[model samples]
Target chain A: HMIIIKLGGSVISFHRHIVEQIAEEIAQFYPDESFILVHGGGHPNAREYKITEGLVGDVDRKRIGFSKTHQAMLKLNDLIIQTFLEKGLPAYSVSSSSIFLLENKEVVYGELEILRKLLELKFIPVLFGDTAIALDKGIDILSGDQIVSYLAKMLKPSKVIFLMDVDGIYDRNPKERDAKLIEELNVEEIRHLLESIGNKLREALKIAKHSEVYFINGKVKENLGKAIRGEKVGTRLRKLE
Target chain B: HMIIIKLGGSVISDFHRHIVEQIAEEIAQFYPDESFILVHGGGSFGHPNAREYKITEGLVGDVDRKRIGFSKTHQAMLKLNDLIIQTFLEKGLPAYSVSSSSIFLLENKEVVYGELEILRKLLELKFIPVLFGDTAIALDKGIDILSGDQIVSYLAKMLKPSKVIFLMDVDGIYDRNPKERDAKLIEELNVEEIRHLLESIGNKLREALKIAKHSEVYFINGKVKENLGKAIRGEKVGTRLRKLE
Candidate 1:
């Protein structure tokens, strides 16, 4: 009955128009079913901080860099949370770094019960890509894609929506003239597509097989509402027969 | 070598701007000579929000309701923390917010202390790491409340601070409430005295006293403008609590 919405950081960074539009769209569904917002900073806000605030210790020092990057990520996360609150969205910012523990650089344990309770109470738990303590790496980045994947497995949500810059998955470069948009894709086809995508896309594909997944252009406000309603507005991924 | 200061939310709520200014001035004097960590609460923010949200329920089948209360408390605390950090920065102090909920997990209503490394690093760089009472995940209960006193005590024990100062609304711990005209001012106390006082006062101070083995505890009236600086300098300006050894 619940939905997990992944808001890409790049789309948010582009302009306030889309963020405001999406917030409006989500607010309409507030009294009905629950929604959890998982986010990422696509522009590398931490890298910008590193250039401005010095190297944050030696380039080889892992812990120091992780800490600094985590702090930078928090800055954006707080801003997003504040924005949602101002819009009267009943959104609560949950720190992924604080709640989840990484084992072998993968999320092994998290406070899912707390998340469930929040959902039951009609509160939207907002999680962002963060640096978490890891057993192997001392510290590692827990990307938003990984978080969305992990939660999908644990929560068995009805739908998982990935808001991206493109309208849908394309056969070739999205910018190319003849690249056809794949409006509907099955798990088997998604697996083939995953081979050529980045780690984030691959990770999203790996864990989204259980629930319906959508790739919609977040820049368009109408597309968000359509995706949430399970309407045919973007590329949909379903389990193979 | 270090001091741990606990600023009561009641006191902060009453005189926020002035108290923040005084704290900034006091902290500046301690920086080059001694280090300190500040832990505070969001009374003005949390209490009002809690009442509005009807958050008095204990753990029960009402687990979802309790979780709502906990989340509301965190939101209020973060807003107050933001205000405090902004005030400190305006006064030229670089204060960083280390949220307790993010770092500490409650096991049997006690802090597990998972943020020491980060605290150590921040202290080494002389940055004032400001923390606040927050909602914590519990071992038995789904979530529990963390007090500033508990946070101060744990940090004092782990860091072995030279002194722990509790800034409150009253002059000090009195024989009765401040409204009682005949109430005696308990100017000084030791661990044993505090143990006896626990029966009269409450359990929070007792728990803080037990863990604060090496640090001297001081209770001072935050309304008194100069007391904070005087206490930090080891000048006698309030009730001091020490070990019997």
Candidate 2:
């Protein structure tokens, strides 16, 4: 009986004020004890420039990139927590790297015994995308969507919501005037759009019906509030519809 | 058997070049397969903020400051942890970081069982699990301080590692302050001697000495490159605090 929300990097990382707005929205509902947030690593600042700037032939470039991305996401997690604290929300920040281990870009293992305790303790968990240990002795970026899928099945929450920049999945880029935001999508249609989240959602649907899923524009604070209130303000994803 | 290395903030934070040297030289020289876990101290990064916020005293009023300060202190240690992990990654060591704050809950400054299955799994796969001294929310007290040395002692008792090497800037424990010039480094000693030197030595060292009451413990200057590698191979370099048994 909990709600899992993904604060997509596309919205929260790029727009700082959106975090404050969403925090304010949560305060309005005060969804205490029932809320769990997981965030992504999306900073508009160029990623490669840091590695290329002053630094490596002996150094593995891809490994360096993984380090940078994870560090960026850690900072982003801090920022979101700071905003939530400002709103008087008891945001207990948790690093995905601490609990997850990945292999072939999938969550192979999650040491989540502590999560249940944290939730039962009444501390709202704020987990975010991070670099987790890889089985092949390399580092891998553990995405927020994958985290949501894993937790959804394990916890079987009431609803799962993803707060992103776009209104919903669109026919075109949603950039064109003729494009429209699809209000509802089934499993196959999702895998057809973006294989990463699509296949991820499809797997969740395959093994279990953890919870209802939604992708909505976080920039519109009303949308998050509405979604949380179970009003349905964005495209809803279902196993069948 | 596994080995736990306590990288004091004084040695690693202040002398970062020492880290590069240590990793490049010793990390690969004597790295046992699936046998390394690191616990780091706060030093300059976390100590100041913890004091300023009076975080160790736990909560009273203005609950906002205590909460915020605790989070801030944890982040500072993370920054330092990042620096050390990056160095290990660059040198081709599989270093994985585990934060102590949320994992370990305390009751009146004593550990009340945190998660360790994750750590054991990581080590089982040969990834060096990196942890740091951090703040914890207590059952009796709102917030309590968990020192890095205590982390070593706690992990040693549970995991049963054969050896624990403490890396600090000084050569080893001294009769008085090492800066006094008359102070002598005891090549070998037990916990009994530690009690007398407890006043001259810091509390971190006292807790460190307690861990040696079980597993073999050493205090060596990380400033020396060969010392770490030599010590890991069972050659005596710095002061050795033997087991009480």
Candidate 3:
């Protein structure tokens, strides 16, 4: 079985050291077990590009903004791929926009076979959030969370890890002084929390219970490796029978 | 009016630095007056890599093999493209890379252009758009290799450039191989001459000529420093292929 690690953009944006540390941690798993990495470009990157280009509209409704946002994400993805390569990891940047064609706002799903082969060959395929051609709409953003959910169902991985900036899902906004960490969340609890969180995270958690889910702060290098090894350093989301 | 130049792999593989300098000098005059688009191939970069991976025989047949071949070819192309971009920048030309694989789709071995907006915007912004041959996903085949010539022809048909120049190792299309004593450079060729040559040479060149029927096509020896400038200035320095009136 393989592992799918979704690296959130909030932590890696402008944090080069954290990205390098994550790459180093990922390298330790090489020659032992196979894993796939899917990433997102932080909000700042896309928002800045769109604003500078004068492409202001509803984030999901803007056609030209979608292309500009995709280009901005590519820049960040290139940086991440270069870092992994520098760390002696067999990382390859696969353009999701080029491979995944969408129809009526849903991925066509014909391109996953190639990704499967890449995994079988031990090449760590790196994909990022980008714009995809839509059947109904002219274009639409293909979020990283949607990609993680789709892959989880198709690949049926043994674990799904979300490397976030915060520790894990909190009782409330983790930035608050009195917020408490939800150390372990079951399916029902995750469902209830879905309404309060972003759609991307909710969608990921909705489908992620099929396999063990780990939510941990990627900045802590030690915690990331420990959580990957099942040492119980972060919140573990399990499916309820 | 703009010019589209297709720098062949046979000429640029080893003499890239020298050729880039010559091209930079040739392009300096036309930038403020006329814009140009450059399309190239990864010869020394991609061929050897694909051969080593055993994916150079033909279009990838299996799905898994397609992914492997596409990845290898892309890596090599990226290396060559970066070198070219850096060289162009050092020479004071603002060049932007437009990857063909990311924009073009192949349907039954024919390329469908999907990057018109970006190309137009780049030209309007005065940035030279540089593209290269790449691995594309095909409808019938899992993946197919696209040639720079095909891209040039497609772009020419769509953009309707004033002229198209193909810089290669040979002086022009000779009656025989350059090594032969009687091989002479053909100064000009028309549709009839092209048809005769097509039967002798093969189909790839014929397709390029056909797509370029509306534009003046020139074939020049890339080693000749003066020929690039002269050809772009509308001088009669090499074999010119024009459509019949």
Candidate 4:
């Protein structure tokens, strides 16, 4: 049984201490090798090179932009891995660019078997969002959350969790003071509400709807441990067949 | 069937576009369908970081320091891989970059596992999968350098290609150092002869050749594109080693 966890880009990108604290919580409850960590980056670095500008596939310096973005992701990945190591966890880095590629903006190529092998060997495999070779365009971005969705389908984790910057998925938007947290959600509910959610999150929900999922506030530090050990913490989305 | 081609670190590190373009021309000219996989070494990119941290000696001193070195070394290698793939792209070869670290595992300095099924699929799709020497997690050792030469052997065993071409600085394996006055390049050898050469010289390249049996292996001068050209066409240009009759 595996548990797939994704560190929200906004949460980890804010302060080093926040990520450090989250690592401690992970050590506190889920200290074993049945889980894997996939992280994303929020602060966009591609704009510096003008990668996402202009008509489709007309980026000025496409290769430079791709390199810069991938480098940024690796540094972020290195930082998180270093923090986890300092926290005394055996976190191994798996550079995902070579492992996975995007065709038609969906995961088409990946050496996914190695992932479960790493878990079986008692190594806490850590993967970060990396640039992928896109068939439509020359390059494409693979997000951490979507990778979790793929892992959710591949590893068939008992509980899948997404650590967010805020307090779980809000009923409407978090900016509204009147908005309420759903607290509990189901697959059908998520499917019903797909039109209102982000496309990436929608893709994740649809791809990995077979597993029990949650979106929790990572800043709280205790939410991760509670959610992993099966307690109340954040928005719990279940398949509930 | 696929052919495993290794562009030497010393050869590619000089990293002249002239040399890379010639390689591209050869691939385009020879294998119109691009039926080979390219593997390269870190050369100047990763070696300095690896030496400073004593990466091959395993994790020592500050764990974070070594970890950073590992990350830097990997990043440097990726940079080099990206540069090569970019060149291939300009040449119109669908060269896909595949870092060895993600797919290889070592134990006490020996590679025990390498997942190349992905490589096979990529090859079937007619994509020129490019890989490089990288730092990887080891079982007994904290981390180790998975050399490009070793990668070729593991891939050779699995893919069992008809021939493996290794582009090197020199003509081929030599009886002595190429700088020596009487040194002579061993032009051709059988499996037994290669094994004897390995025992005599104690070189890992020869050891790699010994394991990659049944595949006709060639070591040719990479600087001269014609050598690669002739070698790819099954006309021996530098040195050749094959399984015993």
Best by TM-score: 2
lDDT score for residue A240 of model 2: 36
Give Cα-based local distance difference scores for all models: 0.72, 0.72, 0.70, 0.73
Q: Compare the candidates by DockQ and give the number of the best one.
A: 2
Q: Candidate 4's residue-wise lDDT over B147-210, tens digit each? A: 8877887787778877788888889888767898998888876566556666642444664565
Give the Cα error of residue A95 in candidate 2, in Å.
1.9
Q: Number of clashes in every candidate structure?
A: 0, 0, 0, 0
Error of 4 at B124 (Å): 2.5
Pairwise DockQ winner, candidates 3 and 4: 4
lDDT (tens digit, per residue) of candidate 4 on A106-150? 676667755765566555778988776665555667777667767
TM-score of 4: 0.75
Residue B76 of model 2 has an lDDT of 77
Cα deviation in Å at residue A36, candidate 3? 10
In model 3, how well does chain A match by TM-score?
A: 0.86
Query: Higher DockQ: candidate 1 or 2?
Result: 2
Candidate 1 second chain TM = 0.91
Local accuracy of candidate 2 as per-residue lDDT tens digits, B1-245 = 67788887787765375565574458667554438888888867888888888888876676666776776777777777777777877777767678887577777576767667668766765567889898766766667788887778788878878788888889877777788968898888766677777743466666666676678888888778887776677788788877667
Give candidate 2's fnat, 2 decimals.
0.14
Q: Over the stretch B1-245, how does candidate 1's per-residue lDDT look in tens digits? A: 88888888897775378777787787877664777788887668877765554443334566555555666677778778767776776665656667677667566667764557656755665557788887766545546677787788778778888888888888777766779778887788666666676665475567657655768888898877788888888888778877436
Find the 10 residues in a row with the least total lDDT in model 2 chain B: B15-24
TM values, all candidates: 0.70, 0.82, 0.64, 0.75
